[PDB]
Amino acid sequence: KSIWCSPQEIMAADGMPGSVAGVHYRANVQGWTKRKKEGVKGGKAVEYDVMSMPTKEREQVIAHLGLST
DNA sequence: CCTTTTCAGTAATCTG
DNA sequence: CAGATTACTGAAAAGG
């Protein structure tokens, strides 16, 4: 299985830069997987695999998301 | 390592 | 249908 989120959801997670572009930073540098969205205008909108973010970061996102078990 | 600004394309949306 | 606009991000650069 896997999960995906929009930069605004991740950038809002602790441990994350805190800026839409900041996310793209680690994204290309770390090589985050990305699901290209479509229903969103511009079509440039793409989510990133939270299951691919640093283990520590995942907890920030999973906790920011409130998923966990 | 992070922050912020500008640039550009298309995508969907709205009307007569 | 036709024309037109707005709206949405992504990308890069520079500096502390």
Swiss-Prot record:
Modifications the protein undergoes after translation, according to the UniProt entry: C-terminally truncated forms act as exceptionally stable repressors that prevent prophage induction.
Subcellular location: Host cytoplasm
Domain HTH Mu-type: 1-69
Induction: Expressed in the early phase of the viral replicative cycle. When present at high concentration, negatively regulates its own expression by binding to O3 (PcM promoter). PcM promoter, and thus Repc expression, is blocked by Ner. The host SsrA, the ClpXP host protease that degrades Repressor c protein, the Lon protease, and the stationary phase-specific sigma factor RpoS are all influencing Mu repression in response to either temperature or stationary growth phase.
Subunit (UniProt): Homodimer. Three homodimers assemble as a homohexamer.
Family that this chain belongs to: Belongs to the mulikevirus repressor c protein family.
Comment, domains: The winged HTH N-terminal domain cooperatively binds to three operators O1, O2, and O3 with respectively 3, 4 and 2 binding sites. The C-terminal domain (CTD) regulates DNA binding by the N-terminal domain and degradation by ClpX-ClpP protease.
Function according to Swiss-Prot or TrEMBL: Promotes latency by binding operators O1 and O2 in the enhancer/operator region, thereby repressing the transcription from the Pe (early) promoter and blocking the expression of the genes required for replication (lytic growth). Competes with DDE-recombinase A for binding to the internal activation sequence (IAS), which overlaps O1 and O2. The outcome of this competition determines if the virus enters latency or starts replication. Makes the cell immune to superinfection by repressing genes expression of any subsequent incoming viral genome.
Protein name: Repressor protein c
Lineage: Viruses, Duplodnaviria, Heunggongvirae, Uroviricota, Caudoviricetes
Whole-protein residues included: 13 to 81 of 196
